[PDB]
Design a protein around this ligand. Structure first.
Ligand SMILES: N[C@@H](CCC(=O)O)C(=O)O
Ligand SMILES: N[C@@H](CCC(=O)O)C(=O)O
Ligand SMILES: N[C@@H](CCC(=O)O)C(=O)O
Ligand SMILES: N[C@@H](CCC(=O)O)C(=O)O
Ligand SMILES: N[C@@H](CCC(=O)O)C(=O)O
Ligand SMILES: N[C@@H](CCC(=O)O)C(=O)O
Ligand SMILES: [Cl-]
Ligand SMILES: [Cl-]
Ligand SMILES: [Cl-]
Ligand SMILES: [Cl-]
Ligand SMILES: [Cl-]
Ligand SMILES: [Cl-]
Ligand SMILES: [Cl-]
Ligand SMILES: [Cl-]
Ligand SMILES: [Cl-]
Ligand SMILES: [Cl-]
Ligand SMILES: [Cl-]
Ligand SMILES: [Mg+2]
Ligand SMILES: [Mg+2]
Ligand SMILES: [Mg+2]
Lengths: 355, 353, 365, 356
C-alpha cells in the first residue's frame, strides 16, 4: 500500500518561470505531498532555486563571475529556501529536515550508507527530507552537477518506488514542440535508447532516468503546473512521460557507485574494453594502458577506452602506484612485482557499474 | 579600522542553561553583532544548538540511540536553527548565509581555499555567515567533533583578527572558583602549555589552533553585558589568549582542518627530529603504518606511546610506506620501482604537536 | 462582469470541527478567494474563530465563566486570527485590512455610512476586508450576536451581489436525513416563512439548532436587501467559485423580487434604543397595511431615547414586530401616548408631525 | 511589591523618526517590558503607528485626502502592527491581546466597566494588552483624538500605578527646545495649570493626558523612548524625564469613567452658575442654563460651557434636551408644572460631573 516517492522540483516550476520564487505554485505542490503524506506515503523533496532565491533576497546585486559568487548566493539562498519549505509544510502539520549533499558524501559505501540511514530515519519518523546540492561548501569536482542526477541518487538512497521530475513542460517530446507542430509527447519509454530514437534542457533528465531505471526505480517527467500531478503519478496514472524501470535491476549491493566521484582514471585496451562492455568481465591489469591521479585501493575510479570514452566506474583493488607497475602484466606476476597481492583483478565486475 | 571577528555560541549560551533555545538571549547577542556590522566590522557566527532545536521542534520524541537519530534531529534542527538566525538578523536589516561543513571540506588545499573564498565573498557583500558542522550528512570520521574547534578553523578560513568563544562561565580560572574559594580569573595567556592544559578542554585546543595561525582568541561569558563590543575594542572582558608572535606559515594553515587518512608510528629518534629540530620524516624511522591512503593525503604521526605528535602530507601511499618503512632513502627506488624523493613527509607540509 | 461576494466562515469551518484552527482548511479557501480576486471580483471575509483562536493560543486555560473571560480570549485570539489571514493571503500577494464592529457602529445613518465608505475604499484598492464582531470591547447590548447576522450587515455595507455562508454541513434539508432516507438538500428558497423555519427545526434532532436559526435570519435580512444568499458546506471542493458562477452548490435563498428601499437598509444594523408596546389595531396597521405608527395606539414606552434614534415596536404579547426611527423623544411619547394627532402641540408645547414612527423609517417583522 | 504600568509609544518612537517602523527600536522596548513582566509586574501597551504601518505595507500609495483613506490605511496597518507586537513579545514568551476602543466605549458606566473588566482579566492572566484607537471603524465624533489621551483612559481602565508617555525628546521643557537653546528641562510638575499649558502646540496632548491621569491618582511621565533603560527606571521611580505628580487626594473612582465619555450635546451656562460649578463645586440647576445644543436623552453625558465658549465641565444629564430647553431659566419647583414629569431639582448633579 504505502510507497516512497522522490519529487524533484526545478527552478522554473518553483518560480513559475520567473526570477522570484512563487509561493502559490509551491504551496499547491506541498498540498499534494501532504495529501499523500497523510495517506501513509513517504515523500522526499529535492529542491532547486537556492541560487535563484539568493539573488532575490539580496535584491539582485552585481557580483564577479566566479565560483565564489554562486556559492555566496547559495549560502544566502539555501537559508531562504529551507525557511520557505519548513513554513509551507507546517501549514499541513508536516515537519521537514535539511539534507545538503555532494558526491563526496557517496564516495565510500560507509558514507553512502550513513546518508541512507539518515534519510530513512527521517521518513521513518514522518519527516519530509528536503534535499539539495551543498552548493555553498563544495568544489566543482565533488559536486553532482545538477539536481536531476541528485534526485536519482536521492531515490536510490530513499529506496524510492517512483521518481518524479517536475518541469516546465509536459514531458519528453519527439521533436521540439515549440518549433515543430508535428512534435508529440512520448507516453512511455522502455529503456533510455528506446527514447533516443527521436528525442539541451532534457539531457540531465535522461541521465537521471537512466540511473534510476537501472536501479529499478520508475521515473516520470511531467509538468509541475499540471493539476493533481503528484497524486496521479503515485497511482500509476499516465501523466507525462513514464520511463519504465529495468525488469531485473542492477544489484543494490553496488548502486552506491552511481553517486561516487571518481578518484582517478585508468585507460584500457580494445580487448579489455570489449571484455567489460561485451561480457561484463572484470578488468585485468593486462589491458591497462595508463593510470592517472593518486588513489588508494578501495577508491572508485573511471575506466576510459583509448578514445577517451568513459566506459565504466568501479572500485580499484590496487593503489595508483601499484597499478602502473602491474599494468601490462599477467596476474601470476603481481606478487613478484609488488611484493603483495590482492587478487588477479584490478577492478572486479561485482564492484563495477558499466556504461 | 574594520576588523573580522568570529563569534562561537555554544548550546548553553543559546539555551541560557535551559533545554530549549532562548530567543531573548540570542536576540541580545544578534543586537550586539549588528552594532559592529553597522560600524563596518565583519561578523561571522559559529552556531551550535542544531540538535537541541531539533528535539524541541519534534516534541522530545523517543528515538533509538544511534547515529541516525542524532542526524535526523540535526536535519530538522538546523532548519529550525538557521531560520531563527535569519529572522533575528533581519530585524537589524542584516542577511545571513548558511555554510555547513566538516573536515572533509578541508582535506585538500583546493577544498579549503574554496570554502575560504566563499566565506570572504559573503563578508565582502556584508552578509553574516552562520557556520555549523554538517551534522545531518556526515560520518564520524570526517566530523570536526565540536564547534570550538570549528570556530578556530572558521577564523583561519575567514582571516579573523579575533575569535570569541562565548560560554556559560566567566572564563578560564586557575584551579576552580567553586572548589578553591579564591582561584582567580586568568586575564591573559601566552601560549597554551601542558601545565595550562592541566586545567574548556576543547576551548583550549581551539585557542591553541587560532593563536598559532596568529589570531587573538577570547573565552568569555555570553551573558556579560556588552561582551562582544568590548572584545572588539580590546577591552579586558574575560580570558585573552594572545596570538603567537610569529604565526604559522599561511602557506600551510589548511592542514589544521584536514582529517587524517591514516596513521604512522614513528621512532623515538624520529619523534625527536620532528619535534626538536623541525625535520622532515624519513622512512628510516617509521615503525608501522595504518589505513589505505594515497600520496597527497594528510596523515597522523604517533610516537611509540600512541600520542599524536604531528599531522602532515604523505609523499607516498600507504602500501609503499610499509615496504620502505625502516630503510634508507636510496633504497626506495630499488624497493618500489618508483620514487618521490627521500622524504616520507616534508616539514613544509607538516604541522607539529 | 465583476461582482462583490461576502464569504462567511464559521468556527467549525475554520477548525474543521476541532478545537484548533486548521490552516490547511483555511488556506484552501484563501486560494479560492485569491482566484476570484485575481479575476477582478471583490471579496469580503467575515471570520469567526477569535475566541477559539484564543483558547488554543493560551493553552486552554481555566477561567471563570464570565463575560470578561470570553473577551480576554477574544483579544488574544483576534490578534492571532488577523495574523493568520494576513499571512495566508500574502502567499497569493493579497493585502488584508481588519475591521471590528458592533451594532453601535450602525446606530446612525452617519456611522453606518462611515463603515460603508471604509469597506468600499478597501475594495477599491484591492484590499480584502476581514470583518469580525469586536468581542474584546463590547457589552452584550451593542453586539450583533452572531457573524451570520454580521455578514448580512457586511453584505449590505459592501453592496454585495451574493452572500455565502460556509458551514459544517451541506445546508438545510427537506427532512431529517436520519429519520428519512429520501431527505434531500433544499435547492431553492423563495422567501423565508414560518413553515420553512419549522422544516429547518424538525430537520435537526434534539434541542433544534439555534445555530442555523441565525443563518435563516441572516438570509432574510440579505434577501430583503436584494442580496442572494447561499448556505453551503465549506469543505465542498470549488464551492466559492461555483457560488460566484451561479452553480447550484447548496441552498440558494433568492433575493427579493423588489428589495427593501436602500434608503432605509441601515436600520437592519441599528440596536434599538428602547421599545414601544403597541395596540391590537396599531399592530394590524403596521404589519398588514404598512401604515405609520400613531401616538393613538402606543400603550407603553421603555427607556430614555431621543428623536432620530431607532427603537423597537413591541406588540401586546411581547413580540418585536418592527424597528424604526422615533420622531419624538421618549419622555414626549409618554405624554402623547393614547392621544390623537391634533393634541400633540397642546400636550408637549412643540410638535414634529402627526406620527410617532413613520413607515419610510421602519423595518417590519 | 508588584505594580501596573501603561507604556504609551507614539509614532515617532516606533519609527525612530522615520516613515518605516523600526523593529530594532521597538524590540528594545519590548525587552524592557518583558523584564518587568517576568519580575511580576503588569504591563499595558498603548501603540500608535497603525497608519504608518499601512502606508509602508501598501508601498506608499497615492490616496485622496479623505477620512476613508486614513481608515483603510488603519485597517491594513492595525493588522500589521499587532503581528509585530505579538511576534516581538513572543521572543520573550509573552502573549498579547488586541483591544480597539473609542469614546463610544466609555459613554456609559456599563460599557466602561466592561472595558475595565476585560483589561483587568487579561492582566490577571499575564497577558499584555496592546491598545489602540479603533481608527478603521469610527466617525470623528466618537474618537478620543490621539493616543496620549487614550493612554490616560487605559491607565484608568487598567487601574495603573504609573503612566509613561514615551516620546522623541527628554520631556517637557520650559519652552520649545527645537526653537530655543536657553530652555531647561522640567524635572517635576505638581498639578497642571493654565500657565503650564502655555509652556507646552503638540506637547499639548501630553499635558491633557497627564492632567486626566493625575486627577485619577496616576503618576504620569514624559520621557524619551531612545533613552536606555527608561522603562525600568520609571518603574523604580528614578528621575528620568518629567514627572507629573499624582493628585494628593484623587478624583472619586465612582466617577472616573466620565473622563472617557463623548459629549452627546452641550449646555451654555450662566456667569453665576459657572462660578457655582467651578468655585463652589455645586450641581447645575436649570435656573442657570442659557441655551442647549443637540438631541440627547437623560443619562447621557453632555458638555457645559461658560458664556465665552469654554468647556468648564462634563456631566450626566438628568433631563432630555427637548425638556432642558423648556425648563431653562426657570426655578426648580416649576419643573413638574411645565413638563408634566420630574427628575429632581437638578439638571446635572455634581456627583455625575467632572469639572474643568
Ligand atoms: N543547485 C541548484 C540546482 C539547479 C539544478 O540542478 O537544476 C540550485 O539550487 O540553484
Ligand atoms: N581481456 C583482457 C584484454 C587485454 C588483451 O586482450 O590482451 C583484459 O581483461 O584486460
Ligand atoms: N555541531 C553541534 C554543536 C557541537 C558543540 O556543542 O560544540 C550542533 O550543531 O548541535
Ligand atoms: N464572534 C465569534 C463568532 C460568532 C459566530 O460565528 O456566530 C468569534 O469570533 O469567535
Ligand atoms: N391604525 C392606528 C390604530 C390605532 C387604534 O386602533 O386606535 C395606528 O396606526 O395607531
Ligand atoms: N491613532 C494614531 C496615533 C495618534 C497619536 O499618536 O496620538 C495611529 O494609530 O497612528
Ligand atoms: Cl529492487
Ligand atoms: Cl489532488
Ligand atoms: Cl560490500
Ligand atoms: Cl523574514
Ligand atoms: Cl597573518
Ligand atoms: Cl552594548
Ligand atoms: Cl438594489
Ligand atoms: Cl477551484
Ligand atoms: Cl487652572
Ligand atoms: Cl485610588
Ligand atoms: Cl535594563
Ligand atoms: Mg584522491
Ligand atoms: Mg580516503
Ligand atoms: Mg425532527
Amino acid at each position: 500500500d504505502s510507497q516512497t516517492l522522490v519529487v524533484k522540483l526545478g527552478t522554473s516550476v518553483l518560480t513559475g518561470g520567473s526570477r522570484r520564487l512563487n509561493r502559490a505554485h509551491i504551496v499547491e505542490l506541498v498540498r499534494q505531498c501532504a495529501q499523500l503524506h497523510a495517506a501513509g506515503h513517504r515523500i522526499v523533496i529535492v529542491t532547486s532555486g537556492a541560487i535563484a532565491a539568493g539573488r532575490e533576497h539580496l535584491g539582485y546585486p552585481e557580483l564577479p563571475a566566479t565560483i565564489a559568487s554562486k556559492q555566496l548566493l547559495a549560502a544566502v539562498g539555501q537559508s531562504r529556501l529551507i525557511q520557505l519549505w519548513e513554513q509551507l509544510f507546517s501549514i499541513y502539520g508536516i515537519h521537514v529536515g535539511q539534507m545538503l549533499l555532494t558526491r563526496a558524501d557517496m564516495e565510500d559505501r560507509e558514507r553512502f550508507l550513513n546518508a541512507r540511514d539518515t534519510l530513512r530515519a527521517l521518513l521513518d519518523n514522518n519527516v519530509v527530507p528536503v534535499i539539495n546540492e551543498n552548493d555553498a561548501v563544495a568544489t566543482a569536482e565533488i559536486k553532482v552537477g545538477d539536481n536531476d542526477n541528485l534526485s536519482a541518487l536521492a531515490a536510490i538512497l530513499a529506496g524510492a518506488d517512483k521518481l518524479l521530475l517536475l518541469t516546465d513542460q509536459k514531458g519528453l517530446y519527439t521533436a521540439d514542440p515549440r518549433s515543430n507542430p508535428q512534435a508529440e509527447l512520448i507516453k512511455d519509454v522502455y529503456g533510455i535508447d528506446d527514447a533516443l530514437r527521436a528525442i539541451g534542457g532534457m539531457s540531465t533528465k535522461l541521465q537521471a532516468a537512466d540511473v534510476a531505471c537501472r536501479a529499478g526505480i520508475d521515473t516520470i517527467i511531467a509538468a509541475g503546473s499540471k493539476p493533481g500531478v503528484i497524486g496521479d503519478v503515485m497511482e500509476g496514472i499516465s501523466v507525462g512521460t513514464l520511463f519504465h524501470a529495468q525488469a531485473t535491476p542492477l544489484e543494490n549491493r553496488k548502486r552506491w557507485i552511481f553517486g561516487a566521484p571518481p578518484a582517478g582514471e585508468i585507460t584500457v585496451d580494445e580487448g579489455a574494453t570489449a571484455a567489460i562492455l561485451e561480457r561484463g568481465s572484470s578488468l585485468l591489469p593486462k589491458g591497462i594502458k595508463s593510470v592517472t591521479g593518486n588513489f588508494s585501493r578501495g577508491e572508485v575510479i573511471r575506466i576510459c577506452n583509448l578514445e577517451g570514452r568513459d566506459i565504466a566506474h568501479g572500485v580499484s583493488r590496487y593503489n595508483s602506484d601499484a597499478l602502473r607497475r602491474i599494468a601490462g602484466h599477467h596476474s601470476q606476476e603481481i606478487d613478484a612485482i609488488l611484493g603483495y597481492e590482492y587478487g588477479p583483478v584490478a577492478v572486479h565486475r561485482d564492484d563495477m557499474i558499466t556504461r
